[PDB]
Amino acid sequence: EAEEKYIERQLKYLGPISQVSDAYRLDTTTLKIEFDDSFPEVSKPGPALESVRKLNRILYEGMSDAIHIIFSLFLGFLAAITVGFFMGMARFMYTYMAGPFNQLMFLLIASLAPSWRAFFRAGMDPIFESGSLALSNIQVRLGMEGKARHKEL
Amino acid sequence: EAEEKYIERQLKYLGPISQVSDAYRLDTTTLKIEFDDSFPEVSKPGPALESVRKLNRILYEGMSDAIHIIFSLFLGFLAAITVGFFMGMARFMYTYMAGPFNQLMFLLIASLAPSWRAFFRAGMDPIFESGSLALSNIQVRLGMEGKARHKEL
Amino acid sequence: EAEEKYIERQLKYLGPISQVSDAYRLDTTTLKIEFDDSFPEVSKPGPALESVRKLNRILYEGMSDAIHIIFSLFLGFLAAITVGFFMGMARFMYTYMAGPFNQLMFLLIASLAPSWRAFFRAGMDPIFESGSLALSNIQVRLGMEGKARHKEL
Amino acid sequence: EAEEKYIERQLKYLGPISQVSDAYRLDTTTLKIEFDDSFPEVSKPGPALESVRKLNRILYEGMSDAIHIIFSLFLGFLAAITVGFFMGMARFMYTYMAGPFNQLMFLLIASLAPSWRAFFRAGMDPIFESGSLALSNIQVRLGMEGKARHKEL
Amino acid sequence: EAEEKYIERQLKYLGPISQVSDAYRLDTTTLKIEFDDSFPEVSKPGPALESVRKLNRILYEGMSDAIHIIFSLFLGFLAAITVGFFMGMARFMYTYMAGPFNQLMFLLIASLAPSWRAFFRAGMDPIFESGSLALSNIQVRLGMEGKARHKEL
Amino acid sequence: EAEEKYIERQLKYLGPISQVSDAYRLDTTTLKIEFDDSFPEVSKPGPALESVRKLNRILYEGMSDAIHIIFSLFLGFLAAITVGFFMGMARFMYTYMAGPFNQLMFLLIASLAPSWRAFFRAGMDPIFESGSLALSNIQVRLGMEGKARHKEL
Amino acid sequence: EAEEKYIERQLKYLGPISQVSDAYRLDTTTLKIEFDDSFPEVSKPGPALESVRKLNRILYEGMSDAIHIIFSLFLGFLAAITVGFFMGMARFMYTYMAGPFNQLMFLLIASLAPSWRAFFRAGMDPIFESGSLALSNIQVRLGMEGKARHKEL
Amino acid sequence: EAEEKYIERQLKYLGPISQVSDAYRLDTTTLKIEFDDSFPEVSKPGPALESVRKLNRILYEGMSDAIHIIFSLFLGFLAAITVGFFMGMARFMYTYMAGPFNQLMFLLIASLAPSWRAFFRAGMDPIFESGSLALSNIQVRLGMEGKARHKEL
Amino acid sequence: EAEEKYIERQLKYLGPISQVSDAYRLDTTTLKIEFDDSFPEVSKPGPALESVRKLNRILYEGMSDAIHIIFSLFLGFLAAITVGFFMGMARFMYTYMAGPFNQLMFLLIASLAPSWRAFFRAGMDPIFESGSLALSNIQVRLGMEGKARHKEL
Amino acid sequence: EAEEKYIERQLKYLGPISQVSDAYRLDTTTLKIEFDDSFPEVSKPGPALESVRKLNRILYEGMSDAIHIIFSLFLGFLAAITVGFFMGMARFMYTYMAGPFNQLMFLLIASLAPSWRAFFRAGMDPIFESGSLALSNIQVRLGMEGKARHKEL
Amino acid sequence: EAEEKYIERQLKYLGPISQVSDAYRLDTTTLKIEFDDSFPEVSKPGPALESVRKLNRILYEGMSDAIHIIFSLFLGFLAAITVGFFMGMARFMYTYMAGPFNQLMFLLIASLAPSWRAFFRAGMDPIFESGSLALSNIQVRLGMEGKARHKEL
């Protein structure tokens, strides 16, 4: 069962999956809060132990949901208002103060850089043109043996 | 028997299997608690030793299951309640206090970074544009011999 | 649902995606300010919790939009004028003072560099022509085994 | 004989075989306790020496099995009970104390990490964006000679 | 919309794009001075905010263009004349003083270099002919498994 | 003769042959104790020397086999008994004392590791996400020439 | 428009373009002295600004060409004569003094080098023949998965 | 003649030939004791020198064979007996004392190693899981030109 | 025009072009002494400037050729004689003194080297046979995705 | 002529040619003692110089052959006898003293090594199993352009 | 003309050309002693200068050949005799004194090396078997895009 579904999921897409191109992400997607994950089992229960598991499951989940509901209703109500106020101010500041500052800084930088680039390169490039000659004159001799078998499915 | 099933399992999927992309995982899946694994044997028993193995197996497993059942029933019932309370509070705090803090921090960071990026790069890039010339001017001469045999199955 | 659309998006283009060739960019595209992202949830709500989520959503979004509207109307109006003045001056200076300076600097640099290049290379090149002989005389012997299976879909 | 079966076993599967992905394994599978392995021979015996080998084999194996049977019957009986007790307690503790602790630790960690990630990257990334320019501007010239022979079996 | 056009643009040409072969270039092509870029928005406006955006846009752009026009007309007029004078002198000097100096320097250098090259190489080459023997005698054994699936579109 | 059989043996299997995956092996398979190997010859004997070789062979082999037979019969008999006793005890201890200890140690370790993993990674990972940007922006230009000849056997 | 012609120019030739094989070259080909390049613009002008651009263009270009013409006629005339004299002398010296000196130096060097080469190699080569054994005994096990899609245009 | 047979011998098998997998081998196969090898010639003799070579050959070979025959007959006779005695004792000791010691050592080692492995890895692995992120995010752009010619023989 | 001929010249031969295999070469082939190269122009002349260029060209070239002719006739005549004398002596010495010395040195070296080679290798090789085991036991798992488009011209 | 035969010889076999697998070889094959090689010429003689070459050739070769013949006849005669005596003794010692010593040493070594191997590996291996995790999690994105031309001869 | 013949010569053979396998070679093949090479010209002569070149050529070549002829006739005739004497002695010594010494040294070395090899390896190999585990567990994810164009000529 499990391994078959796992292999089916692995065979759909074989390419890269990294997420390093985004620096402003949360970690919430990895967490798992559920009875089968919070209270792991080392080997398969028998029917004599399944009843105990069954009782404990409802106790745990009922308590966990009750507390969350109560706190969300009677304290989240204030948190939403309070966070909304500061988030509105933050949006205003981002639009009307940071962007213009960054654009003006870009203009001030882009007018000086070319001369420094040219000046440094004109003086330093020969040292690496000379060093380039070390990777000329590569020469390889190769010999091979091989066997192959193949099938059509 | 065993090696054949092992090879059959190996030939289904030949790709990568690492799990480094998840930093919040448990190690429970690797453990094996069973008589044939807890009391290993160096070579195949004969029928004169199988009887002793048979007696010891039931003794071990019966004791192991009895203790676990008793403790699960008379002490797990309290652990479930106690853990549920704190887990409810933890969920509330994660939703209503951490997320807003992180989003506000993201807004405060994203408004300063571009200028530092531009300023550093404008001053440091030429040093690596000059160093790039070392990998130009590669030149290779190659010669080959080969034999091959193949079959259709 | 979600994983299928993700895989569909991944399979359209498999090439490089980096943006290092631009040094004057903002980070705004990565941010996400919305209730479902500002107040994350660790596991799927049930219908008893969806109502609380529903109330909190409207409270948060209403406050956030109201503050932004008011500040944009009664303070952004002055910011636009003030930034426009300095941006006009910045454009004039970029066109009529920086460009000529950079072009004259280019002319002054390009008239001296060739002699320094020739002088340095004539004295330093032999040291890397001699070092080039180390990568001659490579010789490889190789042997291979292989099995393959394939399908047409 | 032997080399042929060895080659037949090698040609079934040519892929990786390492076991580094499991950190909780025993070494029992490598051991070999048998007369032909415990008392190795440097060269093939003749029929005059096979008789001596034959006598020594039965002596060794009989003694070895007798001692193991006696100790397994009259001492393994107590070991099974004693180990079963502690293993039951160990299972209970693993399920009802370690898992909840680890999950709560995960929740406490996952709420702080994003801000540290963003803060560090925003300050350190440009230093490696600048260094990336060294691997641009690679250029290769290549020339080849080749001979090949092939067969269908 | 946007991602589709982006992918269409990416699929036209998949080759190298670097510009390191030119050391005398400006950075003007990367800049973007426009209201939608100078005053970025974190999420899509609604129609109640579009009106405020609409007013601010015309204010900003009108002021920015007016100042630039006035300064270009009443100060760029003098800048053009003044820069033209010095640029004419610069062209004359580049043609009639730098080029001859560089050519004469080339002649003076090219008459001495060959002897230094020969003298250094004759003394230093053996040290790298001896070191070349380290990359002889490479020998590789390789085994492979593979599965493949393919389609015609 | 000899080289042909050597090449025939080499062409059967061309894959890897190392044995590093087993840490508990003996070296007996490499030894060769025989007259033609114990008393090597630098060049092919003639018939006048073959007679001397023939006499020496029987002397050497007869003495060597006699001593081994006598010692195996009158001293190996005791060695077999003595080693069998200790090997029986060793098997008992391996089964009934080492395995349980190792399994209990596994349980004690596997309950602590996840938290340390998460804690270390959450603090250290950004330092290597930043360093990952150095291998972006690789760009290659390549040109080729080639000649080929081939045959069917 | 522009990007299409750029891509058309890029697709003609995809090979190496470096110029490191020539050490006696000028940098004139990279420079661009023209009004559209000397006085860059950050964004497209409108028709109200095109008139100002039009006036400034003729002023700049007229002044620049006038000064260059006058100086070329009344001072380049003497520069040509003066440079011609020294260039004639330089050609004579290159032909009749440098070449013979270099050829005689070649003869004096080529008569001593072989002995030094042989003497050094005979003493140093074994040290790198011994070190060559480290790259024998490479062994690889590989496994693969793959999907492919293709089209004819 | 010679080069043709050399090339014929080289073309039979093109794979690896190293012998590093055996640590208990002699060097006798490389030696060559014969007149044409003991008394080398720098260039082809003429018929006037072949006669002198012919006389010297028989003198050398006759003396060399006579001494070897005499010493083999009158001293090798004792060497065979003496070596046979010690070799018989050596075989007995190898079978009946070393093998059991090594097997018992294997059992004593294999019972302790797993715990040390698990303990070290649980503490040290995260440091290399974090370091693994440096080889993500590789991105390559490549362009190619090629010409090819081929023949059937 | 120009770029088309450049590309036509680049597409004829795509292989290596280095000249490091010759240590006794001159640099004359790189130089360019002509009016269009000695007096470079930054941008295309108009017909009003072409006349000035036309006058200066003839002045420069006439003077340059006159001086060279006169010096070649009235001073090269003596240089040829003087250099011929010393070159004749140099050829005689190269043939009749250097070659014999080098051949005798070769004979003296080639008689000592083999013993030093054997002696050093016999003592040092094991250290690199042991180090060879580090590159055994390589194992790779790979997975791929791909899209392709192609045309016949 | 010459280059054609050289290329014909190069195209027969394109594989490896090194000789590092033999440590007991002489260098005689590289030497060339002949008038055309002992007295080299820098450029082709004319018929007026061929006569002088012709006289000198016979003088040199006649003297060289005469001295060698006389010394070979009247001194090589004794050298052959003297070397034959010691070579006979050397062969006897190699067969009847070195081989047995080496075989006995092999037996003494092969009985101790396995325990040291196991003991070291059991303690040191985890340190390199942990370090193996650094080469997991490699991820590559690649894009390509290509042109090709081909011919049948 | 010239470039076409150069390219024709380059396209005949594309393989390795190094000569490092021979340590006893002269450098005469690289030299070029001729008027067109001894007295190089920077640019093509006109017919007014060709006459001066024509006179100088005959003067130089006549003097150079006369001196060489005279010295070859009246001094080479002694050199040939004198060198022949010593070369005869050198050949005799090479055949009858160096070869036997080297062969005896080979026999003395080849009898000691195996024991040192075995002894060192048995103690040092485990250290590199343990280090081999670092290159296991490599895992790669790859994705590709490609375009191709091709022609038949």
Numbering used by the authors:
A (entry chain Q), B (entry chain R), C (entry chain P), D (entry chain H), E (entry chain O), F (entry chain L), ...: 79 to 231
Authors' description from the paper:
Caveolins are a unique family of membrane remodeling proteins present broadly across animals (Metazoa), and in vertebrates form flask-shaped invaginations known as caveolae. Unlike vesicle coat proteins such as clathrin, COPI, and COPII that cycle on and off membranes and share evolutionary origins and structural features, caveolins are unrelated in sequence to other vesicle coat proteins and remain integrated in membranes throughout their life cycle. Using a combination of computational and structural approaches, we now show that caveolins across evolution share the ability to assemble into amphipathic disk–shaped multimers composed of spiraling α-helices and a central protruding parallel β-barrel. Each complex forms a disk with 11 spiraling α-helices and a central β-barrel, with each protomer forming contacts with two protomers to the left and two to the right.
We next determined a 2.9 Å resolution cryo-EM structure of the S. rosetta caveolin complex. A model of S. rosetta caveolin spanning amino acids 79–231 was built from the density map. The S. rosetta caveolin complex, ∼127 Å in diameter and ∼46 Å in height, is a disk composed of spiraling α-helices with a central β-barrel. The variable N-terminal region forms a short α-helix that is positioned about halfway up the β-barrel before snaking along the cytoplasmic-facing surface of the complex. Each protomer makes a 180° turn at the hook structure, which is followed by the spoke region. The α-1 helix forms the rim at the edge of the disk that is ∼16 Å in height. Finally, S. rosetta caveolin has a C-terminal β-strand that forms a parallel β-barrel with a diameter of ∼30 Å and contributes to the ∼46 Å overall height of the complex. The detergent micelle surrounds the hydrophobic face of the disk and reaches into the β-barrel. As a result, in the S. rosetta complex, additional contacts are made with the i + 5 and i − 5 protomers as the variable N-terminal region of i rises up the central β-barrel and contacts the C-terminal β strands of i + 5 and i − 5. The three β-barrels have a similar outer diameter of ∼28–30 Å; however, the S. rosetta caveolin complex’s central β-barrel is ∼10 Å longer than the other caveolin complexes.
